[PDB]
Design a protein around this ligand. Sequence first.
Ligand SMILES: C[C@H](CCC(=O)NCCS(=O)(=O)O)[C@H]1CC[C@H]2[C@@H]3[C@H](O)C[C@@H]4C[C@H](O)CC[C@]4(C)[C@H]3C[C@H](O)[C@]12C
Ligand SMILES: C[C@H](CCC(=O)NCCS(=O)(=O)O)[C@H]1CC[C@H]2[C@@H]3[C@H](O)C[C@@H]4C[C@H](O)CC[C@]4(C)[C@H]3C[C@H](O)[C@]12C
Length: 1189
Amino acid sequence: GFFQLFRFSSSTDIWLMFVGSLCAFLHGIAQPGVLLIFGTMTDVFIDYDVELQELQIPGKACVNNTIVWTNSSLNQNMTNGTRCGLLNIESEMIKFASYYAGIAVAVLITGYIQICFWVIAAARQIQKMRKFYFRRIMRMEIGWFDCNSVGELNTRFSDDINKINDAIADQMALFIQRMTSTICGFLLGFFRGWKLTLVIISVSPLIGIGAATIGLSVSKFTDYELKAYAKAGVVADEVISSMRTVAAFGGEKREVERYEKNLVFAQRWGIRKGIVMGFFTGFVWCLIFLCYALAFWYGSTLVLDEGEYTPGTLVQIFLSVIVGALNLGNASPCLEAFATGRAAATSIFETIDRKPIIDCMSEDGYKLDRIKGEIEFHNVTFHYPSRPEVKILNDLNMVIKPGEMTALVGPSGAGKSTALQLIQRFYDPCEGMVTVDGHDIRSLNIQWLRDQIGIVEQEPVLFSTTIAENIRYGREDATMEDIVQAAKEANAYNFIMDLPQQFDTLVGEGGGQMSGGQKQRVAIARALIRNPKILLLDMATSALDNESEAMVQEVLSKIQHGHTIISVAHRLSTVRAADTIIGFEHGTAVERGTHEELLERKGVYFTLVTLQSQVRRILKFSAPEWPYMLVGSVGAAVNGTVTPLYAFLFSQILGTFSIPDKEEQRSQINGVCLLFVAMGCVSLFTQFLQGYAFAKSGELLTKRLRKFGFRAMLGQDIAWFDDLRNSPGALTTRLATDASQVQGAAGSQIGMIVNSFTNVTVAMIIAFSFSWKLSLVILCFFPFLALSGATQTRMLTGFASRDKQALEMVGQITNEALSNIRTVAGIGKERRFIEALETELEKPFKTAIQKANIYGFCFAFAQCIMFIANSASYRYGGYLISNEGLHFSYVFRVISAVVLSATALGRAFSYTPSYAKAKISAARFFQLLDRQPPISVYNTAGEKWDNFQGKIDFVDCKFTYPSRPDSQVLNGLSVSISPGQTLAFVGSSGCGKSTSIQLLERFYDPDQGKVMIDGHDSKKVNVQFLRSNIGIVSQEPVLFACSIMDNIKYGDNTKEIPMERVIAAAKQAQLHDFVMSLPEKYETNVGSQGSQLSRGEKQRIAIARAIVRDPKILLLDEATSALDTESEKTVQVALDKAREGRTCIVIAHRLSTIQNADIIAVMAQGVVIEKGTHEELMAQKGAYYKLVT
Ligand SMILES: C[C@H](CCC(=O)NCCS(=O)(=O)O)[C@H]1CC[C@H]2[C@@H]3[C@H](O)C[C@@H]4C[C@H](O)CC[C@]4(C)[C@H]3C[C@H](O)[C@]12C
Ligand SMILES: C[C@H](CCC(=O)NCCS(=O)(=O)O)[C@H]1CC[C@H]2[C@@H]3[C@H](O)C[C@@H]4C[C@H](O)CC[C@]4(C)[C@H]3C[C@H](O)[C@]12C
C-alpha cells in the first residue's frame, strides 16, 4: 500500500510532518494568490491614464475640463467629480508595493518550514527503518541466507531504501503545494467570471499533458540509455577482461568492428531523446502563446462592450488558469516517485516481520548445567532448503561417547559439511530429534547451546578490527592477561613478538593480512578462550600453503586434549591416532571402529587407502559536424529572442486598453493578438530544430569518439592493462559514461552561449531604450534571479545529495557481518554487529539534518526574490508615472523584460552539461588517443620476412615485472634450441618460469639479456609477422560468446577464414566425436546463456583454438589442471597430438605429462644448470628425484 509507508513514526514525528503540511498548503496559494494583486494593479494604472490623456486635450468643455483644473476645493459642484486627485498614483503604489513585500516575507518563512520539516521528519523514519531491517535480518535462520544473495541484500539496504526516502521526504511537500495551487488556480478563475474561463479551460488539459511529459521524460530516458548502451557495453567488457588472448591471436583489427556495429543503438535513443524533450518543449511553448490569443481576442469582446470585465480581471482569470495547468502537470514527476517507492518497499516490509524458526531469543528453552559431553544423532533425514529434492543424510545413526576424539570419514561428499552442522543447530532435522545429555537440541536456549560448542572453520575469515579484540570476540569477559594464554597455546605468541606492533596491529582486513596458515592460528585462540567442552573442526587446513601444514596440525593433534573432539580429516594420515572412527559411505555411519577392526572389513578407511594412501582539440576533432551545429545555431538565435519579444508585445496589448475610441480596441487589439499566432506557430518549429540538431551533433560525435577511443585502447602495451588503478572493471566506465561528458564542450555550449547572447542583449536594448532610469533599479536584482532560474529546474549545488560517501562506512560494517554469516552465528554473538551499525548510523543522519536547512534555505530565497523584485521596482515605477512623465506601458515593458529574461538566462544554464568536467574529460581521451606505447600492433610493419623454423634462443633473461612491484628480479636464463624439440621448464613456483614464456610473445620486453628469433632480436622483430606463427594455450581457458565452431573459426582472421582445416583439426585435436554428440551440429552457443561446459572438456577447445592456424612454435603454458584425472587423460591424449614437427615449451606441472622429451633447465633461482635430457637426473637431483626422496 502507499499510506503504509508512514509506519515508523513516533508521536513527535507526526506533528513535525503536520506543521509542514499546513505550511505547504499555505505556500501553495501564493502562486495564484499574487495574481489577485497584479490583476487589480494593472487596472489602477489604466484608470489613471484615461483621466490623464483625456485632460491632455483642450477639447469639449475647456472652461471646466470635464471636472479637472481644481473644481474639488469648492462646495458641492461635482455631479460627476471623479476626475481629480481622487486617484493619487504615488499614494496607491505604496498601498501595493507593501502587498508584495508582505507576501515576500510570508513566503520566505513558509517555504522554509515546508522543506525543513519534511526532510528532518523523514530522515528520522529511515534511521528507524534501516535499523529494524538490520535487526530482524540477523535473527533469521541460516537457511534463509542460503537462498538469498549478498549483493541482493545490499541493494535492499542502500539502493532500495533510497527510493522510499525519495517518496516520503522531499517529493511530498513539493507535491501538495503543486496540488493546492492547481485547485486555487482554477477556483479563483471561476469566481471572477465564469464564461471567460470556460473557454480557456478547454485547452487547459492540452497545455498540461505536454508539460507533464517533460518532467516524466528526463528521469525515464535514463532507464533506456543504460539499457541501450549495455547491449554494446557487454562486447567491450569481455575483450578488455580477457585481454591476453585477443592479443596473441591478432584479432585487434576486427574486434572493434563488432563494437562499432553494435554501437548505433546508443546513437538512436540519443537522437530520440532530444526530439521528445525537444518537440514537447515547443508544444508547451506554442500552446501558451496561442492561448493568449484566445483570452485577448474573444476576451476583448466581453470587456469592450459587455463591460462585465474590467481589463485587470481579463489578465487575472487568464494567467491563473495557465499557472493552474502548469502546476497540474508539474505534479506528475513526483506522482511517479510515489509509485516507484510503493512498488519497491514490498520486500523491506516483508523481511521486517517473519518470525522464523531459530533465532536469538533468551526465553523458550531449558538452560542446563553440567553437560557430560554427550552427543547423539537419532534416525534423521535431512533436506537443504535450497535444493530440497535430495535426502543428504540417509537415516544417520551415531553416538559420540565423551572424553576423547571421534572421526568422520567419507569418500568424496558423504556427510562433508551437513553432518557436522546439525549439532550446533544451524538447521533442523525433519525427522529424528537429536539430543545432548538428556533433552534434545530444541527446548533449550540457543544462547546456552552455542556457548559450549566451538568450531574451527574451513577457511579463516577475520573481521576488520585488531588482533586484540579479534580474539576477544569469544567470551568477552576475558582480559589482556588471559587472551595471551590462548595466543601461545595456539602458537601465535611467536607471531606476537615478530610483528610491527603488539596487540594493535590493524591487519584485520584494511591492513596487510597474513597467510592462511597464520590466519588459522588466530581462530584457534578464538575457540580456546571460551573454555569449550565440544570441539568441531571441518577440514581446517584446506585452502592455504602446505609449508604451514606441519606446525598447525601439531596444535590440533597434540596440544588439544581433554574432552570431546569431533574432527574430520583433510587426509587420513593425521586421524589415524583416533578414538572411534565413525566414517561411512552414504548417509548412515556404517563403520564405528578403529583401523584394526577394519583390517578385515571394507569400510571407507580400509577402502580409500589403496588409491590415496599408497577545446580547440574538440572542435577540430568534431570536424564533419559543421552542418548540424550551424542549423542548430540559427535555430538557437530565434528562440532566444522569443523571450524578450514576448515582453515587448504583452505590454503592447496591455497598453491598448487605454486608447480612448472604442473602435480602436477592435482592430489594434486584433493586429497584436495575431502576432502571437505567428509567435507560437514559429516556436513550435524552431524549438524542435534547436533540440534535434544538438542531439544529433553531440550524439554523432560521441558515437565516433568511442570508436577512436576503443581502438587506441585496444592496440597498446599489455603492461598497462595490468597497471594498478585502471583495472578492466574500471576502464569500461571511462568508455561508457566519461565519453559522453565531452558532448558539453562542443555541441551544447553553442546552444547556451548564443541562446543567451540573443537573449540578454535584446532584453537590455528594449529595457534601456525606453526608461534607463527605472531599468537600473531592477537590474540590481539581476544576478539573484539567475539563481532563481538555475534552481527552478533544480540540480543547484544546493541539493547536497552526494553524501553517499558517508554511507560507505555504513556500507562496510553491514558487509563484513553478512558476507560471513556462518562464523557470526556459530561464534559468540551477533549482538555487536547490531551495535556497531547503530553507532555508525549517526553520521548520515547528521548530514541529513544539516542538508535540511540549506536546501531548506536556498529553496525559499530562490522563491521570495521575484516577489521582492516587483516590490522595490513597482514602487519606483510609480515615482516615474506621476512625477517624471513616462507612459504606464513602459513600466510593464522594462520591469518585465529584465526579470522575464533574468529567469530564462538561468533556466538555460542548468539544461547544459557543465564545462569544468568537460575540459578535463576530453583531456584524458586526447592523451589516450595521442599516446605512443613502446610496443604495439599498429606500427608500420617492417623488419620481417624470415622463414622461422623455431630457432628461438634465450640469452640471460633478467626480468622485473616492471609495472607491478612483485619483485625486482625474475630469473635470468639462457636456452638455445633446434626446431622440433622441447624446453620443458619445471622448478620454482612464483613468477619465475611462467613469466619467461609469457615473455615469449610481444607482451613484455627484456630490459637486458636479449633473445633471438632467427639470430635476430625481439626489439627488431615486428609484432605482426612474428605472431602469425606461434600458438599459445593459457592457464584459465577463455572462450568468446559464440558457438563451438566459431571459436574454432576464431583461430585465424589473417588468412581466408577457414572451414577446410576445421575438419582436419577435428579428429586431430580430439573433438570430432564430441562435436557430434551435441544438441545441434555447430550452433552450440556456450558464451553466457546456454548450458555451460566443463573446464576439463573446454580445454579441448582451448587447445583446438590454436591448431586451426599453421603454427611453427607451440606455447603449451600450464594446461591440464582439472582435478579429476579421468578427464585429464582425455586432454592428455590431445596435447600429445599437437607435436611432431613443432617447437614446444610445455611446463608440465603434473609430472605424468611427458618426461624424456628434451632438457629441463629452470630451478628456484632459475639459473641454467641442467642443459640435459631426462637421463641425467640421477647424480644431480631433478624433478622426479625430489618427490621420491
Ligand atoms: C510553471 C512553473 C513555474 C511555477 C513555479 O515556480 N512552481 C514551483 C517550482 S517547483 O515546484 O519547485 O518546481 C515552471 C517551473 C518549471 C518550468 C518548466 C521547466 O523549466 C521545463 C521547461 C523549460 C523551458 O525553458 C520552458 C518550458 C518548461 C516546460 C518550463 C515551463 C514552466 O516555466 C515551468 C513549469
Ligand atoms: C505569467 C505566468 C506566472 C508568472 C508571472 O509572470 N506572473 C505575473 C504576476 S507577478 O509578477 O508574479 O506579480 C508565467 C508562468 C509560466 C510562464 C511561461 C513559461 O515560462 C513558458 C514561456 C517562457 C518564455 O521565456 C516566456 C513565455 C512563456 C510562455 C512564459 C510566460 C509567463 O512568464 C508564464 C505564463
